[PDB]
Amino acid sequence: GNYNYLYRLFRKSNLKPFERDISTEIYQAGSTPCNGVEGFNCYFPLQSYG
């Protein structure tokens, strides 16, 4: 186990110093946006370490 510890994998732009991006807003496809659905395109930004 120990899947509690997450880390952000994809973001639209690099962080400012001491930034805290708590939002799990879905990443941008490059194509037309995905207004709240995962899949092919607009993937989920977080990722569990394991």
């Epitope: 899947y3 799990t24 995962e38 092919f40 993937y43 989920f44 990722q47 569990s48 394991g50």
Partner: antibody, heavy 122, light 108 residues
């Protein structure tokens, strides 16, 4: 080991429900998306949907949205697929599959379970 | 669904091909088309993952590429190891994946 451990075969009364469980092993359970595909013994193969152990989001086809739900269980590194109404048209071997894609949801389905045979009788 | 020819024939050491006639929509411009090799009584494995790419452990005898609307993978120098049916797959828009009907590779 990337072998998926899949639950035993189950027989169900028609119209009722059934749940299928696949236990991941060896690989990292978190990011790797897990699809669910059915193969009727007649012919062909069809795709229902996927669950991801990272976020828990679902998606389905139109043929199964509102008729079948899926869920995860990160404690035992397993994901469950639930069917609400086991119709006689749904006698099939249900396969759980992993994608090559690491944390993205491309449909590159590589390693498959040994086959949980689902039988609907009357 | 994706239409597909039902069968193909050959002999060990020959070269044959298989295809599935999907539309220009949902196959041609909508990439990530993949094929799978399925023996009866056992789980299948991905055999071409991209439109033209082989996963690790794939033998060199297998090759495929989309061609306009249709897609096709051909096998040369076959043996008794390839007596299985072959299913193709495409994204087909908005998380609604579809498989083909499946063609059976036969060897004399």
């Amino acid at each position: 080991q990337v072998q998926l451990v899949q639950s035993g075969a189950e027989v169900k009364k028609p119209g009722a429900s059934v749940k299928v469980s696949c236990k991941a092993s060896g690989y990292t359970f978190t990011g790797y998306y897990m699809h669910w595909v059915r193969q009727a013994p007649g012919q062909g193969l069809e795709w229902m949907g996927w669950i991801n152990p990272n976020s828990g989001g679902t998606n389905y086809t139109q043929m199964f949205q509102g008729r079948v739900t899926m869920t995860r269980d990160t404690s035992i590194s397993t994901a469950y697929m639930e069917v609400s109404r086991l119709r006689s048209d749904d006698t099939a071997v249900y396969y759980c599959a992993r994608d090559r894609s690491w944390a993205v949801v491309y449909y590159y389905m590589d390693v498959w379970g040994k086959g949980t045979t689902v039988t609907v009788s009357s | 669904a994706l239409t597909q020819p039902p069968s193909a024939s050959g002999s060990p050491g020959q070269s044959v091909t298989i295809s599935c006639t999907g539309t220009s929509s949902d196959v041609g411009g909508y990439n990530y088309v993949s094929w799978y090799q399925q023996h009866p009584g056992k789980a299948p494995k991905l055999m071409i993952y991209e439109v033209s790419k082989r996963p690790s452990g794939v033998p060199d005898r297998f090759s495929g590429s989309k061609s306009g609307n249709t897609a096709s993978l051909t096998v040369s120098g076959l043996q008794a190891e390839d007596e299985a049916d072959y299913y193709c797959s495409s994204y087909a828009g908005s998380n609604n994946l579809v498989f083909g009907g499946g063609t059976k590779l036969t060897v004399l």
